[PDB]
Amino acid sequence: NLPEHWTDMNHQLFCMVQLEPGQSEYNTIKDKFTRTCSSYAIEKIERIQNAFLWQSYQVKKRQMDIKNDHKNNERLLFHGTDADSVPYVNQHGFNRSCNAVSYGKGTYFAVDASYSAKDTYSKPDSNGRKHMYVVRVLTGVFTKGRAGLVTPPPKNPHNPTDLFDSVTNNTRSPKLFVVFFDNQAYPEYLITFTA
Template sequence: ETTFLLRCFRKNCCKNSTCGCFQCFTREFSGQTGSVHPVLSPSLGVYRMQMGQLTLEVSSGDITKETCDVIINSSNQNFNLQAGVSKAILDNAGPTVLLECAQIVKSPGYMPCSMIMTSGGQLPSSNIIHIIGQNDAAKIKEMVQGVLKLCEENKFRSVAFPALGTGLCWEQHWDDMKGSILKRVPLTAGSQEYNDVLADVTKNGLSLNIIQIERIQNTTLWQSYQLLKKQMEVKNNHTNNEKLLYHGTGAKSIDLINSKGFNRSYAGMHGAMYGNGSYFAVDPAYSAGGYAKPDNKGHKRMYQARVLVGDYTQGRSGIIAPPDKSGNAADQFDSVTDRPNNPSMFIVFHDIQAYPEYLITFT
């Protein structure tokens, strides 16, 4: 599979005998030193830069053909992602690598971690470092630093990264879509992902009898949401645009929300005190209480959603879009709220402005 690659090559050890070259690079990567040379392009599509004793090279290519000491596989929390570049790596490495991953994860005393290392299997590289994929820039930087530290500890002299955090079709930790657009994935109780969702739901003392937590994988909705997120970051000149919020609903709306998102015609049935949009609560207790309608079994449903609230202002009854900023019709607020200084709810007016990430079924 062709992708953009970042290769790091270290030369002979640096003059400081107590410090390895990947460690030197990590300091420069963190902005602590400044021996950075201009970017050169020795051949078409190849860009090279010297940083101390390290050479950085960016080009397009097939990471499964790399001859570096180690390549990086951006995977999921179980390190068995069978999609995209990860699938290409695992397919070419052969079954022994996937077996190694499974043995590590299932080994006694294993603690969930952000990366593991296996052999390269049938690949030209001698080792593979499998990481949990990230899209957040700060987390990617932290992950790269962790990889370089592991490379230094193992005395590797070269490492190849695929382009990290650039995919729009799905999250790195998603299960294989197998050609479908929508997939509901039940989370394993006690897994890190399950516990993360549960911790946010119960952080204010809410007690629920959880029946199931499902991850909603919808490639069309996710791609649209991510594109809007990037556009909002450019428009607002900051990245503090997204919040994890909650939306309670009835069983009849679930299939529509999973497939089409929070369309205001069926997701905004909670009144219109602050505008005719889709409503999301800061406190899950609010959504779980009056708006998560029980079915004939007594089961209630609530979404933990990613919502692009962006720059927001006071809402009011009857509005169908956020107000303009300072009277400028070309520059609107992104959402409205009940209390701008201490919001308890947010209202959005675009269907792709919220993504139904987790469906929580409870009593």
């Protein structure tokens, strides 16, 4: 059940599609980035069309929507990474098994592109090129994280297996989320940019 805005893949299951500047989709994603990174330079934005990763993500979204008895389990967040990780993320998504892990041993996502834009995350390559994903994240019901978590905490220590979906640095005003399971994040766009 592939999304209407994807473009045809001639019966293949993975494509990176460069967006056309000035069309609605490019403009929307560029605006999310420019909200906090207006001083950067965008080289290109690519849509990630990974049928398998999308399928697995959408199954987990449907499950989280049933469990939590609402929609509103998804957020659009940012993830800076090095050029050497991009091929893996495009094909396989985010892997906690692959910086500080102060809020747990998961994959980190920022609310603001400006945070992911730090060189510690979006490491510049030999030509100054930096890479950041725009990511659909199943944040669900979240709690404050802490060092050394391998999964989110339970919602009640009386039922130890009924977990929070994600953790954050601050529940009232989150700036980062950590997820601990495969297929809780779908890399939707890749932004290539410079300082």
